[PDB]
């Protein structure tokens, strides 16, 4: 339930994080502010962290 | 030929190690003391080094 | 158009490089001086950088 003023401000992002073991990966779900991510391609949900 | 006081004390562990070139890999095995490794998944052949 | 003095001095090498993202790879090619590379394959076109 998002106040109109906040629509588009937050995005729910799923990513592949590294783990303690070099050969394993884990799925992580976290909430980012729109100001910290950028789109990559347009008309797609591929987003990356702003400073990479 | 392992005496009773050595049971189990040593383990013969194999793993996939990195090498000089990023697209190459090698199979390595070595002998570890039991005190340096910790079982992963309770009773299983899978183990990780104690400090990883 | 290579003069006689330069035959075998330069090679056109293609490789897969890392990118800004952990999951994305790029094909890169460049011109190397022969003195900077060492063949790993006998008759193959496989070479590696001199200091790896």
């Amino acid at each position: 339930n998002i106040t109109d003023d906040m629509r588009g401000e937050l995005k729910n992002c799923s990513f592949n994080a590294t783990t303690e073991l070099r050969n394993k990966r884990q799925k992580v779900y976290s909430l980012f502010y729109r100001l910290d991510i950028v789109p990559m391609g347009e008309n797609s949900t591929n987003y990356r962290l702003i400073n990479c | 030929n392992i005496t009773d006081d050595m049971r189990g004390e040593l383990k013969n562990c194999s793993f996939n190690a990195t090498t000089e070139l990023r697209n190459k890999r090698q199979k390595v095995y070595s002998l570890f003391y039991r005190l340096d490794i910790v079982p992963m998944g309770e009773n299983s052949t899978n183990y990780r080094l104690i400090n990883c | 158009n290579i003069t006689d003095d330069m035959r075998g001095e330069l090679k056109n090498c293609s490789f897969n490089a890392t990118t800004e993202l952990r999951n994305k790879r790029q094909k890169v090619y460049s011109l190397f001086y022969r003195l900077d590379i060492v063949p790993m394959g006998e008759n193959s076109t496989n070479y590696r950088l001199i200091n790896c």
Partner: antibody
Framework: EVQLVESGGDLVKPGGSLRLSCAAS????????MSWVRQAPGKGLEWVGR??????????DYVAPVKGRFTISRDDSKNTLYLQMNSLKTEDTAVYYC?????????????????????????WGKGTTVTV | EIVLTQSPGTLSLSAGERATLSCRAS???????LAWYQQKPGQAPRLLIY???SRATGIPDRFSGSGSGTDFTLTISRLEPEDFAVYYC????????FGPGTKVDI
């Protein structure tokens, strides 16, 4: 080695209820999507339904002819999958199986996800029944 | 739901022959969801191939398939005694329904 340890089969009539279930061994269900399929004697394979991992929402999908009377849930402690059936038809006689897809990606490095060993295992339970 | 049918209705091939089995979807389900399974009678079905391409781990390389729109297929390059089983295709066009099951016989 990965196994779905299936149990709960029994002798039932349409005028009753039955819960079938599978406990995992080796494989855990924290990231397991799972699905039930049934095969009536003399018939081919009919999908019953699917449950997504609770970490991805716990959403389920059911096949229209079996919807409502056949539902799917997950334990999340002892790795057990459940199929709860109630108020069944004479048409529901079948061997039911639990199935899952095991995806293993063993990476060659912790610095790039380019070179790795991908293994895909289709794991089935033994098959239990719903009788009439 | 998704309706899949098979052709030929039964296969009658000797071991060593190319036991090709095809199927058809009423729905134009993308090939990226195609799968085939081998069911030895009395056993749970075993996945051979998925994504109209990827082989399941442990499956012999005599098994390979392909497909596109409604036209999907499985090739056994050489039939072996281990293959005399019922084969099914599955098309996950938002539902994993299966075809009826086609027996490979001689």
């Amino acid at each position: 080695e990965v196994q779905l340890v299936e149990s709960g089969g029994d002798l039932v009539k349409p005028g009753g209820s039955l819960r079938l279930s599978c406990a995992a061994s080796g494989f855990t269900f924290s990231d397991a999507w799972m699905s039930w399929v049934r095969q009536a004697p003399g018939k081919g394979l009919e999908w019953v339904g699917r449950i997504k991992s609770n970490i991805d929402g716990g959403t389920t999908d059911y096949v229209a002819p079996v919807k409502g009377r056949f539902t799917i849930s997950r334990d999340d402690s002892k790795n057990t999958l459940y199929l709860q059936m109630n108020s069944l038809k004479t048409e529901d006689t079948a061997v039911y199986y639990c199935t899952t897809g095991v995806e293993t990606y063993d990476f060659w490095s912790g610095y790039d996800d380019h070179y790795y060993d991908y293994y895909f295992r289709d794991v089935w339970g033994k098959g239990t029944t719903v009788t009439v | 739901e998704i309706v899949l049918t098979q052709s030929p209705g039964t296969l009658s091939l000797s071991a060593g022959e190319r036991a090709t089995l095809s199927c058809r979807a009423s729905q134009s389900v993308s090939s990226s969801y195609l799968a085939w399974y081998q069911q030895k009678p009395g056993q749970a079905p075993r996945l051979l191939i998925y994504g109209a391409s990827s082989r399941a781990t442990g499956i012999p390389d005599r098994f390979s398939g392909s497909g596109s729109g409604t036209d999907f297929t499985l090739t056994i390059s050489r039939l072996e005694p281990e293959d005399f089983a019922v084969y099914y295709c599955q098309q996950y066009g938002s539902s994993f329904t299966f075809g009826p099951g086609t027996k490979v016989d001689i």
